[PDB]
Amino acid sequence: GSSGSSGKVWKPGDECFALYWEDNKFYRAEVEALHSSGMTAVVKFTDYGNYEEVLLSNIKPVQTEAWVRDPNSGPSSG
């Protein structure tokens, strides 16, 4: 299509951070299934592994393991 568009869409099978309904804190999770309507979605919390209905506007994309190897030692003893 066209490259160069701001935005972010969720999908069933992506790890994300959802705000607990009892802690209201950002915790790890995974988009279990979105809602036809397009407002809330079922996300599974890793903390225990239970599903919770949270809004899409209350979810954040989890960073990826962009590790980098190199023969040059980076961090050292302080």
What CATH number corresponds to the domain at position 55? 2.30.30.140
| Backbone φ and ψ of 15, nearest 5° | -70, 125
DSSP letter assigned to residue 64: P
Enclosing domain of residue 29: 14-62
Helices (H), 1-78: none
Residue 28, H or E segment:
strand 26-34
**Which of 22, 63, 64 lies closest to 45 in space, CA to CA?**
22
C-beta atoms surrounding 42 within 10 Å: 17
CA gap 13, 23 in Å, rounded? 24
Q: Are 16 and 62 in contact (CB under 8 A)?
A: yes
CA gap 38, 32 in Å, rounded? 14
Please state how this structure was obtained.
NMR
CA gap 52, 45 in Å, rounded? 7
For 13-69, the DSSP string reads: T-EEEEE-TTT--EEEEEEEEE-SSSSEEEEEETTTTEEEEEEGGGEEEPPP-----
* Gyration radius (Cα) of the chain, Å: 17
